[PDB]
Amino acid sequence: QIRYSVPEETDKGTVVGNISKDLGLEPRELAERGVRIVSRGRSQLFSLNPRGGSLVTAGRIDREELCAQSTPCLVNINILVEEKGKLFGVEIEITDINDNNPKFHVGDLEVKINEIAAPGARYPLPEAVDPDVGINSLQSYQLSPNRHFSLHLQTGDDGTINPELVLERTLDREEEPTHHLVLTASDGGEPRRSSTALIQITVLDTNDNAPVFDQPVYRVKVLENVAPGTLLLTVRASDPDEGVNGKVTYKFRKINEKQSLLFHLHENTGEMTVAKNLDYEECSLYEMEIQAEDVGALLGRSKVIIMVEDVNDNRPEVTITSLFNPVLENSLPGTVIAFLNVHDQDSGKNGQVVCYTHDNLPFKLEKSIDNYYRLVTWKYLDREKVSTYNITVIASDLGAPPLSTETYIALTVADT
Ligand SMILES: *[C@@H]1O[C@H](CO[C@@H]2O[C@@H](C)[C@@H](O)[C@@H](O)[C@@H]2O)[C@@H](O[C@@H]2O[C@H](CO)[C@@H](O[C@@H]3O[C@H](CO)[C@@H](O)[C@H](O)[C@@H]3O)[C@H](O)[C@H]2NC(C)=O)[C@H](O)[C@H]1NC(C)=O
Ligand SMILES: *[C@@H]1O[C@H](CO)[C@@H](O[C@@H]2O[C@H](CO)[C@@H](O)[C@H](O)[C@H]2NC(C)=O)[C@H](O)[C@H]1NC(C)=O
Ligand SMILES: *[C@H]1O[C@H](CO)[C@@H](O)[C@H](O)[C@@H]1O
Ligand SMILES: *[C@H]1O[C@H](CO)[C@@H](O)[C@H](O)[C@@H]1O
Ligand SMILES: [Ca+2]
Ligand SMILES: [Ca+2]
Ligand SMILES: [Ca+2]
Ligand SMILES: [Ca+2]
Ligand SMILES: [Ca+2]
Ligand SMILES: [Ca+2]
Ligand SMILES: [Ca+2]
Ligand SMILES: [Ca+2]
Ligand SMILES: [Ca+2]
């Protein structure tokens, strides 16, 4: 029936209550009558101060350990006055003080959310506990800011609270594979204590990105006399998908195209090289289509264009299409004696032909229609001074290194 109050975690020997006044006696009388305390468990932590004539604490008083989460912390002791033969009941309340932070059971948690996870899905979060009760228990859950997540305080009927992370915006690990959040838990008493909990969010990969070539069309020029195996090109295709979902193989699209037989595209490195010799005079252009795939068979498509260059390799060929061999000695300057056809299978300046004959001879070569030539006469001839002629005609293309074919025209001069 003697109520008192005391703060916990207080020093030893702190005043609990003026017992001698509420007993109607002096301190020396308390030390004289032999008034003691009845031997019970909790009463071990209290003691009687005669000089102070009061009630002092003789041990550590932790409410969090003593009464746990009960709403009032009460300790009842019985005081026995022997000479008066009377007994008194003392009820002592212990107040709560915020010396315990909200302690998370787990310091960190990994939440594996898929890349293709739809918004609205919620995942459980680590809970906190505060041995401090009342307003000194947990009161505020503060989640670190993030554009993709929110904090929901779902309350099961039994559980007082249950924090959970809510996915409100879609994710893509191709931009960020892992997130890091700070889950602060604070109790609403002064001084304000708190404790955090780091939450890593691992975004698992989904093969949602297909291989994409750097350029849609690849153009490359090449000489026709390149040795087989020469590195013509090296194609690159990017796949941001993780690991095995990013390993890309390149291959030709067509099924055993002749161009695919002529060339080799390496599967792993994508290096396009020559396999067999290729002549400009057969095909000057090669249009092929290549593709790149990850393991998910996601298709990227591109087109490689190969242009050949006509380096000189074919010499001209002279075809004497006409020859008026019995030449008249009295022929006027300007009469034709032989028509020639010249043809260089090469192209450009490598296919342009020029013809040459000796200077001392009275016969010149003149150009004509459709790369023809005519062997014209411009000076009169002494029949005996020149009876037989073995003319050397040299056809040569204008592409270095020049190629030359020589044809010999046999003729004889006759008179009348
Ligand atoms: C007009 O002249 C050409 C060649 O031009 C002249 O003769 C050469 C020998 C050189 O001195 C040149 O600088 C010169 O301007 C005559 O062509 C020649 O034809 C003969 C046979 O028709 C070739 O003989 C060859 O001999 C070898 C080895 O014996 C054989 O394997 C061959 O099968 C072939 O028989 C000779 O090589 C060839 N000249 C050249 C340079 O190739 C051409 O006959 C002549 N015209 C007339 C009407 O006489
Ligand atoms: C318990 O309470 C009594 C009464 O309130 C206290 O007695 C007072 O002591 C002070 C000491 O300076 C005096 O000035 C007052 O005149 C006293 N009042 C009365 C009514 O006696 C006493 O000191 C307190 N403590 C103990 C151990 O008895
Ligand atoms: C948790 O938050 C409180 C503020 O409410 C801080 O004072 C404390 O140090 C902890 O960071
Ligand atoms: C929240 O963050 C702090 C660092 O500021 C940690 O020390 C704590 O354990 C919790 O993870
Ligand atoms: Ca305490
Ligand atoms: Ca406390
Ligand atoms: Ca607390
Ligand atoms: Ca993606
Ligand atoms: Ca992905
Ligand atoms: Ca991929
Ligand atoms: Ca050629
Ligand atoms: Ca050529
Ligand atoms: Ca040529």
Author numbering: 1 to 416
Q: Which text from the study accompanies this structure?
A:
By contrast, in vertebrates the clustered protocadherins (Pcdhs) provide analogous cell-surface diversity, but in this case generated through stochastic alternative promoter choice. Biophysical measurements with domain-deleted proteins showed that Pcdhs also interact in cis, through a membrane-proximal dimer interface involving extracellular cadherin domain 6 (EC6) and potentially EC5. The specificity-determining cell-cell recognition interface of Pcdhs involves domains EC1–4, as shown experimentally through mutagenesis analysis and suggested by mutation correlation analysis.
The γA8EC1–4 crystal structure contained a single molecule in the asymmetric unit, which is engaged with a symmetry mate in an anti-parallel EC2–3-mediated interaction involving the same surface of the molecule as in the other clustered Pcdh trans dimer structures. This crystal also contained a distinct interaction between symmetry-related molecules, also mediated by an anti-parallel EC2–3 interface and with a similar buried surface area. In order to confirm which interface is the biological trans dimerization interface, we generated a number of γA8 arginine mutants separately targeting each of the observed interactions. Only those mutants that targeted the interaction surface in common with other Pcdhs resulted in loss of function in cell aggregation assays. It is this γA8 dimer interaction that is shown in Figure 1A. Remarkably, like the γA1EC1–4 dimer observed between chains C and D, the EC1:EC4 interaction is not formed. However, in the case of γA8 the interaction surfaces of EC1 and EC4 instead make contacts with the EC4 domain of another symmetry-related molecule in the crystal. Since we have not observed molecular species larger than a dimer for Pcdh EC1–4 fragments we believe this alternative EC1:EC4 interaction, as well as the additional EC2:EC3 interaction, to be an artifact of crystallization. The absence of this interaction in some of the γA crystal structures is therefore likely an artifact of crystallization, perhaps due to crystallization condition, although it does imply that the EC1:EC4 interaction is not particularly stable.
